[PDB]
Amino acid sequence: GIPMNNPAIKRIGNHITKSPEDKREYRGLELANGIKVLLISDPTTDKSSAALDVHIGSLSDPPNIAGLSHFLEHMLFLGTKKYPKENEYSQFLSEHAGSSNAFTSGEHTNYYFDVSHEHLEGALDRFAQFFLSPLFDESAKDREVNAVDSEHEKNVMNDAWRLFQLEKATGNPKHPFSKFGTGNKYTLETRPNQEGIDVRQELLKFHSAYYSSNLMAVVVLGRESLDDLTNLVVKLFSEVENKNVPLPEFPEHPFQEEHLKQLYKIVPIKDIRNLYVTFPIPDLQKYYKSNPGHYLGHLIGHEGPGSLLSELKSKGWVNTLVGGQKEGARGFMFFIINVDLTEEGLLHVEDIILHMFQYIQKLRAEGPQEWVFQELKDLNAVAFRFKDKERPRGYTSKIAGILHYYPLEEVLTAEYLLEEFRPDLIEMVLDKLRPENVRVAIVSKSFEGKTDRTEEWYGTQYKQEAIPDEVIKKWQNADLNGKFKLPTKNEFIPTNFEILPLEKEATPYPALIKDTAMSKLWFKQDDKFFLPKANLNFEFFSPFAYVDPLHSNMAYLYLELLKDSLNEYAYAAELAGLSYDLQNTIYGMYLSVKGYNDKQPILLKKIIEKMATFEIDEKRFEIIKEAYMRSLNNFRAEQPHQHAMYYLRLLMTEVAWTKDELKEALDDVTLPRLKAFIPQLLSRLHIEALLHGNITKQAALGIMQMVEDTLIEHAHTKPLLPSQLVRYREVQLPDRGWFVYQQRNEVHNNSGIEIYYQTDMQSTSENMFLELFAQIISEPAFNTLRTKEQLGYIVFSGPRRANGIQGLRFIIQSEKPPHYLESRVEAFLITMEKSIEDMTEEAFQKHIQALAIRRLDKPKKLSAESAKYWGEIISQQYNFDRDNTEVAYLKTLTKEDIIKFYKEMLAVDAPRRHKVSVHVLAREMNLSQAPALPQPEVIQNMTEFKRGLPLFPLVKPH
Amino acid sequence: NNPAIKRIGNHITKSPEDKREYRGLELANGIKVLLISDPTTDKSSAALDVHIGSLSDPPNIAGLSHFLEHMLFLGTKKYPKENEYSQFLSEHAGSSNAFTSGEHTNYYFDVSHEHLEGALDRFAQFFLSPLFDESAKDREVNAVDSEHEKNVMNDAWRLFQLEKATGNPKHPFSKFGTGNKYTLETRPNQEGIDVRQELLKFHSAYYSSNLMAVVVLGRESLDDLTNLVVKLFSEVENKNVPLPEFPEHPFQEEHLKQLYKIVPIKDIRNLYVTFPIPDLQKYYKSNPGHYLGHLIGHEGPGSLLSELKSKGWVNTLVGGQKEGARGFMFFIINVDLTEEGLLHVEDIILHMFQYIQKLRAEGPQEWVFQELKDLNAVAFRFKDKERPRGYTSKIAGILHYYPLEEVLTAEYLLEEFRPDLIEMVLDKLRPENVRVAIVSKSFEGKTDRTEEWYGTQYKQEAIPDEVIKKWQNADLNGKFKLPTKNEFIPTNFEILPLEKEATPYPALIKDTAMSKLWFKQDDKFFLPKANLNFEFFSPFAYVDPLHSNMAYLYLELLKDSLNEYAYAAELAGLSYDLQNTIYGMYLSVKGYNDKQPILLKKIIEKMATFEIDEKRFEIIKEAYMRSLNNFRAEQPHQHAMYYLRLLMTEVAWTKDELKEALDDVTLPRLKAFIPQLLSRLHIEALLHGNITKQAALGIMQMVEDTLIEHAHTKPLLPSQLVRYREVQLPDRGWFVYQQRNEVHNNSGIEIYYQTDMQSTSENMFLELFAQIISEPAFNTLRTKEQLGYIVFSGPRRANGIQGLRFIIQSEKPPHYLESRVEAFLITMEKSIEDMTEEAFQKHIQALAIRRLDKPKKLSAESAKYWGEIISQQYNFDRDNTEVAYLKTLTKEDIIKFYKEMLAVDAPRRHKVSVHVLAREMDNLSQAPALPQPEVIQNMTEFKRGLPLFPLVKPHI
Ligand SMILES: O=C(C[C@@H](Cc1ccc2cccnc2c1)n1cc(CNC(=O)c2ccc(F)c(F)c2)nn1)NO
Ligand SMILES: O=C(C[C@@H](Cc1ccc2cccnc2c1)n1cc(CNC(=O)c2ccc(F)c(F)c2)nn1)NO
Ligand SMILES: [Zn+2]
Ligand SMILES: [Zn+2]
C-alpha cells in the first residue's frame, strides 16, 4: 500500500549516515517551500537548540550600502510582529537557560540558540518570526547601527582584519569579493543619509528579496521524538514564502591576470614578520569525496622530517608554516603557503619562495601517492568513528551551514569520509601552483615609511610592485632539492581501540590513588563516553618558575625551546589524533596529553625524557628569544578591555610580573644562564596529576611513576616540602572602599573598563548568592547597557573568580570615557534593586531553574569532564560533587536572601562594598539617574597599593 | 671637717671626653664611695657591692648568700610592703637587679632622675634591717630552685661546676653556689637548721660597712650627692670583718696531670687545658697574665690558632688568665674540636706547648706590651659613655681593688713592663702542671663517674707519664711566630666639623634603583668613630631552605676566611659583623673611623670574589649541622618563642627543614649560588658618625662599584622588595600549638594577645597597659604564686603588628600557667578601675621617661635609627610624637582598650598560645572559664586558613 503524502513535506530523506558511537537519532527532510531540514532527537540532552542558515551573505550587499546583510542580522534580534517586545527573544532564552548568536559571512547568515529542553517550542516560535515579520523598528535601527560601528572599531587596529580586507582590495575592484562586509556608521547611516537612502526600506527590501525559503536550512535538536520534531518544524516554518531566488555564483576569479605576479609590502600594527604566498585555484567544493586540495595541503603543509618547513626552519628563516586550500566562494578558491619570518628570513624572501617551488616540484616529480590518500582516508574514518559528542548549540549551527552543500543523507559524513582516489584532480591542482600565478605579500615594520597606498576601510599602509620577470624565471627553474622528502608512514596511527571494561573498584569522581611527597595522583576510569581516549594532566610545582621576572622569562623560553625541538617528532602524533600542550605557569609548568590512548605512553615518555635531558640549540635560543621579546611588546596592541582585565589581575594577585618587568629582565637571559636554570628548576618538584579516560588504575599508576622515574634518573628530582606548596592570595579590599587604576591604550581609539565588586571567599552560600544574582541581571545588563544605551559592542557582566575569592564584574569597551561608563553601570544597578523586589515568586523560581539547568548541564565529551575535575584540582578545592551540592542549596534561596545580599555587598550604600575599577583610556582620550559616587582612591603604584592592604585566606580543601 | 666622712679623695682621673663629674670618698664606717654628677641624665642609678659571696656560704647550707640576695628584695623594717622596692622603681621608670659571685654580692638599680632619694632610701634598707619574712622565705626558695633548674641541663653550667668538683673537695672553691630547694629547705629541715636564723646570722656577720662600696649617679651636684649618701649609708654598722683569703690553690698536685672525659648535653666537641697560677691581681699595673693571653690567644698570622686551624683540628681558641679568688687564679687554653681534632687531642696539646716554648725562647717583648699600653690608652680616652645602671654596678665592684683617684683608669692604663713577672707566670705553663678535659658525646657509655649537683657523666684518668714527657720535650715549630706590628692602629682622631647643613636625624642622601643611603653626621658624642650599616636585599637569600643554608654558609665561610686579617683590626677598635637575614645580608662596620675604609673595601671585595676552600666548607658545614640539631637542647621558653615566630610569620623555615636541606649543599652548588645571590641586589645603608656627607656618598659608591665590577650586580625591581606579613588572627579566636622539649624537665609557654597594626594610638595603648601590668605581673606570677624563675610580660612587635605577650618557664603544666595568667588579667581589671588618678599619671610619667631616655653612645643612637630603617617605617621623631600622644591618654581610654582587645570576653581578643611540654610531661584568685582552643596540628594549614595583615605605611 502506497503512503500518504503530507503536503507540507516535499520529501523525507533516507537514513542519515552517522557514527556507530553516535546515539542521537536523525531525520532529514525537505519542506514544500524548499527549506532543508535536519531533526536531531536526543532524549538525554539538557539543552535544546536550533539554527537557521540563509545562503545569502555580504557578497550580496547592495553596492551602495556596504554591510547591509550584517546589519540586518543584528536587527532580527530586536523584535517581530508577533513578538514585538524588542528583547522578547533574548529575554526568553536568558530566563530558560538559553543563549543565542549569529554571524554573517560572504554567502551565509547563520542564526542559532540553545535553551532548556522543556522550552524548545517557545524559543523556536520566537525564533521563527525572525524570518517572517521583523519590525526593523526605526528607533531600534538608529541604536543598533552603533553596535555594528563599535564592532568594526574593535577590528580596525587588528592586523588579521586589516590583512583580510587588504587582500580583498588588491583583487578586481568590480568583483563582489572586494566588498566590505562589516559595515559601520558611515556606510549604514551617514552616507545613506547624505544620499537620501531610507535604510529601513533597504532592510525590508533585502529581507524580502533574499530571505527566501529556498535558500534556507534549519536544524532542530531536542528531547522530542523525530515525529514530534517534524510536526514542530512544519508548523513553524511551512509559511516562509518561496521566492525561488537563484543561488549567487561567482565563476570569475577575483584575481585576474593583472593581479598575478604581484608583490605587496605591508606595514603591521604589531611588530610581526609574515610572508603570504597565494595562488588562485578553481572551486574544489564539488570534489569533497577526493579532496585534492587537502591532499596537497597535507604535504606542502607537513611539519615532519623532510618537509618544506623543516628546511626553512633549519635555515633560520621561518618558524611556522600554514599550507593548503583556502575558501573563497561558490566559483573560486585559493591555495596558500603562509610563513612567519625570522630576521634573516625577511632578507631571504626570494629564497624562501624558491624553496617552496622546489618542494612543489618534488611533488610533481613523485606524482600522486595512493598510500598518502589512504592514510588521510583512514585517519578521517577513525576521527569520525570516535568523534566527541558536540554541544548542541554549535552542532545545529555547523550542520545548518553544510546542508546547503551535501545531500541530506551525507550532511554528517560529507566533511569526514573520503571515498575516491583522484590522481587526475591532484595533478590538476598542482599545475595551478606555479610562479606565473603567484601573489606575494610581506608584512614588516621595515616598510614603515616606504609605502604609497592606503586601503580605505582600515588604513593599511602598503606598496604594490610587479615581481621582476627574472625572479619569476628563477622560480620557474627550480631544480630538485635533496633536503625535501615526502613523509613516511605515520607510525602514530592508532590501532587498539579496545574499551577496557569498567574495573570493579571504579568511582564516579576522580579518586586520590597516590599521595606522596613527590606526586599526588587523581584518577578516573571513564564511565560515560566509552571512546578510546584519555586525558593526562600534570601540574609541576617549582618555586623557581616565578620567583622573579628573570626566572619567569627562563621558564617560558625553556618550554618554548622544548616544544620547538619536539615539533618535527610530534607532528605525526598530532595528525593521528594525539596531541599535547606545555605551558609555564605562575607555579611551575603544565603538561597535557589528550587523544587516543593507544600510543599516548610513547609520546608522554618522549616529552618527559626530553624535559629532563634538555639540549638547547643556540640558533633556536636566539630566534625564540627574539620572538618572545616582540611578543611582550606586541601586547601594547591588544584590545582596551583586554588591557582592563590584565591590569585587574595584576592589581588583585599577591605576585604578578608585568610585561614591562618581563621585557626588562629578558636582556639578561643568556644561553649559559638558561642552561643553568633548567636543572635548578627540575631539582625540586611536586607533581599533581589528573588521569582520566580509557585507562585502568594500574596503567595510571604506571604512567605516573614513569614520569617520576624519568625526572629522578635524569634530573635528580627530589620532592618539595609541604610548606613550599604555597598559592597566591587575593588582595582584600576595605569595606566600602573604591580604588581606580587608570592607564592608556596607545593603539586603539576606544576605552575599556572593568569594574569589580569583590564579595567574599568562595563557599556554597556565597557562590550561589553571586551566581543567582548574576543570572537575574545577565539579560537586563546587556539589554540596558548595550541594546538601549549602546555603550559599546563588548558588554559583559558576571562572576569573577580568582585565588579562591569572588565578586561581580562588568566589562565594557566603548567610545565613551571610563568615568561615564561607571555612572551608567551604577545607574543600572539601582534599577535592578526595584526589579528584584517587584519580581513575583514565580519569576524568582524561574531564574533559579535557569541557573540550575545551566549548572547541572552534564558534559558531552571526555575533555569537558576532565576540565571540570581539573578546575576542582588546581583550585585545590577538590569539590567534585559541587554541582549537586550547590544546586540543592540554590533551590532553597529566597528573593529576600538575594536582596539582603545585594544590600550588604553590592548596593552603592552597602556597608561591605568592595569596589575596584580599571580605566583604560582610548589612545586620543532621558537616561535613568546615576547615583552619586564617593571620591575614588587613585592607585598610582600597584606595589604600594598591595603593601597597604590585607591578603585573603585560601579556601579550605574538601 | 664632717665626722661621717673619713676622707675625701682627690681629683678622680677621667677621660678628657668624659663630661660627667666625679667625687670619691670613704665613709667613717669604711664604705668606699664614688659619686657621679651628670646634670643631663634621664635616669639616675645606684649600686652597692658587698665583698662577700658564695665562697663564704656555710658548708652545710649551699647557696645561702645567693638566697640572701633574693630575700633582700622582699621587704625591710622601714618598708615592709614586700614589693615596695620593685613597685617604687616600676612606677618611677626604674629597674633593678643583683648577682652573687664567689666573693661579691652586687645590687643596683636605676630610676627616673627626679626620684633618686626615694629609690636610694628604699635601697639602703637592704643593708640595715631586712625582714627575712618566713612566708616570703618559703616562696622565694622556689625562685632559686627554678633558677638552678634552668641551668641543670646547660652545658656551660655543668662544666663550671664539674671543674669545682674535680679540685680539692675541702676547698671553698668546690662549693655549690646557686643553691636549690634541696640545699635551702629540704635538707636544712631534716637536719634541724632554722634557715631564717641562718640568713639573719649571715647578714649580721658579713654585711659590714667595711666590706661595702657604693656608687651613686644622678643629676644633683656632687655636694648634694655627698649629703644624700651620708644621710642614708653612714648608718650601716661596721663589724670590721676580715676579707676572706684563699691562699692554698684548689688544685694541688694530686689534681694535676689529670685527664677528664665528659659527656655533654648538646653535640659539642671541646678541649679545655688549665694551669694553676698564683693570684696575679696585685700585678695589675703590668698585667703579666694578660700579656701572655694576648699572645697565646692571638688569631693572626703565625699564631697558635692559625696552625691548629690550618691542620683542620680547631676552629676557635681562647687563652689567658681566668679569675679565681683572692689567693688563686688559672691560666686557660680552650679550643673547640673538629672531628679530626677530637682524634688528635694529644698533638693539639703538643702544639700548645710548642708555642709556649717559643715564647720562652724569644723571652718577653716590650714592644708588644708597649703596643697594648698604647691601644688601651686610646680605648680609655674615647670610651663610649655608659648607661648609668651598668656603670654604677661595674664601678662598685672595682672600688674594692683600686684607689679612688684611679678607679676609672686602673683597668685600662698599664704602667711599666715587668718581664720578670711574665717569665714567672710562663714558668707555670708546663706539662707537669696541666689539667686536660675533653667534651664529646663519643664518651657516652664510656664513663664511670657522676657529678653530684648536675648529674654530669664523666671519667677521670691520669695522663701517662710517657705523654707528659713528650710534651716536656716540645721542639720549636717553624709555623709559630710572634704577631707583627698591628697595622690597623688608628692615628687620625680629628673630629670633622659639623657641616653647615647637618641634620638632627638621618637624611636620605641617595636614592637610586640600587641604593637607599641614609646619612647623619654625629652631633652628640664627637668621638672619632663611625657606624656603617648595610642591608643587602636579595630574593635568593631565603627563597627555600636550601638557599637559606647557602646564604648562611657563604657568610660563615667568608668570615672564617677574613678572620686572620680582621683580628688586628678588632684589636685596634675596628670591628664588623656579617650575617644572613631572611631578606638577604647584613653588614655592620663600627669603630674608629680612621682605617674603616680599608676594612670595608676588603670585606666587600672578598664578598664579590670569594673562593671557597673545600676543607673549610666541609668543617663549617658539619658545625652548622650540629648547630641545627643542638637547638633541641635549648630552654623551653626559648622553644616557645621560636614556635610562635614560626606560626605568625608568612614564610619561615624550621630547623628540621634547614637540616634536611643541608645534605644537598655541595661545594659546586654553593659556588654557583654566590654569583646568583650577588647578581641582583638592593642596598639600604645607614652611615652615622664622624663623617661628612661627601665621605658617605664616597663609601656607598665604593660599595656599589666593587659589587658592579666583580659581581656584575644590578638593581632589583621595586616590586621585588617585599617584606613578610603577620598572620591575622580572627576575632574571639584562641589557638594553641603544643610541642615537647626532650631535654629539659621544665615546660614553657608564650601567650600572645595580638592587638592591631602599629600606629601612634595602638602603640601607646599597648605600651601604657604594659607599663601598668609590668610589676603586678612579676609580683603575682613569680613572687607570690612562684610559677617559676622566668616570668616576663610586655609588648611583642613583629612585621608591623603588635600585641601583649606573657612568657613563663615552669614545672607546672602549660595549661595551668594559662589559667593563672588569665586569673591575673582579671585581677588587673579591678586594679585599674580601683587605681587613683595620681597612680595612673605616675605610670604615664614612667613610660614617658623610658621612651624619652636619650642614647648615651653612637651605637645606641645608630641602632634607634636602624630600627626605623629596616622596619621600613622611617619615623625618626617617633618618641616625641608618641610621648605627646601618651600624655593625653586617660584611664578610661585604657579600660576601653582592655575590654575591647584583651579581656576574656573582649570582642576583638586574638589569642594564640605555644605550649612546650617538659621532657616527662603529660587561696588563689579564681581563673575564668576558657573557650575550647583550636588546636594547631600543621603550621602550613593554619597559615593557609587565615588572612595576612597589611604592612605599615612609611613615614617619609
Ligand atoms: O556580531 C555578531 C554577534 C552578535 C549577534 C547579536 C546582535 C544583536 C543582538 C541584540 C540583542 C541580543 N543579542 C544580539 C546578538 N552578538 C552576539 C553577542 C553575544 N551575546 C551576549 O553577550 C549576551 C549575553 C547575555 C544576554 F542576556 C544577551 F542578550 C546577550 N553579542 N553580539 N554578529 O554579526
Ligand atoms: O637571679 C638573680 C637576678 C634576680 C634578682 C632578684 C631576685 C628576687 C627579686 C624579688 C622581687 C623583685 N626583684 C627581684 C630580683 N632577678 C632579676 C630579675 C629581673 N627582673 C624582672 O624581670 C622584673 C620586671 C618587672 C618588675 F616590676 C620587677 F620587679 C622585676 N628577676 N630575678 N640574682 O641571683
Ligand atoms: Zn555583528
Ligand atoms: Zn638568683
mmCIF file of N, CA and C in Angstrom, chain A residues 208-236:
data_model
loop_
_atom_site.group_PDB
_atom_site.id
_atom_site.type_symbol
_atom_site.label_atom_id
_atom_site.label_comp_id
_atom_site.label_asym_id
_atom_site.label_seq_id
_atom_site.Cartn_x
_atom_site.Cartn_y
_atom_site.Cartn_z
ATOM 1 N N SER A 208 13.082 40.743 2.094
ATOM 2 C CA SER A 208 12.085 40.193 1.184
ATOM 3 C C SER A 208 12.717 39.573 -0.068
ATOM 4 N N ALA A 209 13.796 40.156 -0.585
ATOM 5 C CA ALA A 209 14.414 39.606 -1.786
ATOM 6 C C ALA A 209 15.177 38.323 -1.492
ATOM 7 N N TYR A 210 15.867 38.254 -0.352
ATOM 8 C CA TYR A 210 16.792 37.151 -0.150
ATOM 9 C C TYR A 210 16.408 36.195 0.956
ATOM 10 N N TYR A 211 15.628 36.618 1.937
ATOM 11 C CA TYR A 211 15.218 35.660 2.959
ATOM 12 C C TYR A 211 14.090 34.794 2.398
ATOM 13 N N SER A 212 14.453 34.015 1.389
ATOM 14 C CA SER A 212 13.534 33.103 0.727
ATOM 15 C C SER A 212 13.674 31.694 1.308
ATOM 16 N N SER A 213 12.554 30.987 1.449
ATOM 17 C CA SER A 213 12.656 29.640 1.994
ATOM 18 C C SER A 213 13.581 28.746 1.155
ATOM 19 N N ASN A 214 13.726 29.015 -0.150
ATOM 20 C CA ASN A 214 14.545 28.112 -0.964
ATOM 21 C C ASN A 214 16.042 28.269 -0.707
ATOM 22 N N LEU A 215 16.474 29.322 -0.012
ATOM 23 C CA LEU A 215 17.864 29.496 0.385
ATOM 24 C C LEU A 215 18.111 29.160 1.863
ATOM 25 N N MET A 216 17.189 28.431 2.509
ATOM 26 C CA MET A 216 17.181 28.235 3.959
ATOM 27 C C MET A 216 17.377 26.769 4.345
ATOM 28 N N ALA A 217 18.197 26.553 5.376
ATOM 29 C CA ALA A 217 18.352 25.249 6.010
ATOM 30 C C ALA A 217 18.165 25.418 7.507
ATOM 31 N N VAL A 218 17.358 24.549 8.134
ATOM 32 C CA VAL A 218 17.213 24.613 9.587
ATOM 33 C C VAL A 218 17.584 23.266 10.191
ATOM 34 N N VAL A 219 18.140 23.341 11.403
ATOM 35 C CA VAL A 219 18.452 22.182 12.221
ATOM 36 C C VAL A 219 17.824 22.402 13.592
ATOM 37 N N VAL A 220 17.131 21.383 14.091
ATOM 38 C CA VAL A 220 16.494 21.416 15.400
ATOM 39 C C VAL A 220 16.923 20.177 16.164
ATOM 40 N N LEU A 221 17.414 20.380 17.388
ATOM 41 C CA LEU A 221 17.836 19.311 18.284
ATOM 42 C C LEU A 221 17.045 19.422 19.581
ATOM 43 N N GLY A 222 16.377 18.341 19.976
ATOM 44 C CA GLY A 222 15.640 18.375 21.223
ATOM 45 C C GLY A 222 15.416 16.978 21.758
ATOM 46 N N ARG A 223 14.758 16.932 22.917
ATOM 47 C CA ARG A 223 14.428 15.668 23.552
ATOM 48 C C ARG A 223 13.317 14.938 22.825
ATOM 49 N N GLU A 224 12.493 15.669 22.081
ATOM 50 C CA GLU A 224 11.307 15.135 21.446
ATOM 51 C C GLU A 224 11.660 14.079 20.401
ATOM 52 N N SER A 225 10.678 13.222 20.120
ATOM 53 C CA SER A 225 10.796 12.230 19.069
ATOM 54 C C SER A 225 10.981 12.896 17.706
ATOM 55 N N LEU A 226 11.485 12.111 16.750
ATOM 56 C CA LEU A 226 11.663 12.645 15.406
ATOM 57 C C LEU A 226 10.325 13.060 14.815
ATOM 58 N N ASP A 227 9.280 12.260 15.056
ATOM 59 C CA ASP A 227 7.951 12.618 14.571
ATOM 60 C C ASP A 227 7.462 13.928 15.182
ATOM 61 N N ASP A 228 7.634 14.107 16.494
ATOM 62 C CA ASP A 228 7.234 15.379 17.093
ATOM 63 C C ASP A 228 8.105 16.535 16.620
ATOM 64 N N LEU A 229 9.405 16.307 16.444
ATOM 65 C CA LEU A 229 10.217 17.375 15.888
ATOM 66 C C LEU A 229 9.767 17.729 14.478
ATOM 67 N N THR A 230 9.276 16.743 13.715
ATOM 68 C CA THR A 230 8.830 17.045 12.355
ATOM 69 C C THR A 230 7.595 17.941 12.367
ATOM 70 N N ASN A 231 6.579 17.561 13.136
ATOM 71 C CA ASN A 231 5.397 18.403 13.237
ATOM 72 C C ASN A 231 5.767 19.804 13.678
ATOM 73 N N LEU A 232 6.670 19.908 14.651
ATOM 74 C CA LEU A 232 7.014 21.217 15.186
ATOM 75 C C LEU A 232 7.603 22.108 14.106
ATOM 76 N N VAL A 233 8.519 21.561 13.291
ATOM 77 C CA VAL A 233 9.217 22.351 12.271
ATOM 78 C C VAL A 233 8.280 22.718 11.131
ATOM 79 N N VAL A 234 7.414 21.782 10.736
ATOM 80 C CA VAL A 234 6.410 22.076 9.719
ATOM 81 C C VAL A 234 5.486 23.193 10.202
ATOM 82 N N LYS A 235 4.914 23.022 11.392
ATOM 83 C CA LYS A 235 4.075 24.062 11.966
ATOM 84 C C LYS A 235 4.746 25.430 11.861
ATOM 85 N N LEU A 236 6.028 25.531 12.231
ATOM 86 C CA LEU A 236 6.607 26.860 12.407
ATOM 87 C C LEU A 236 7.255 27.428 11.160
#
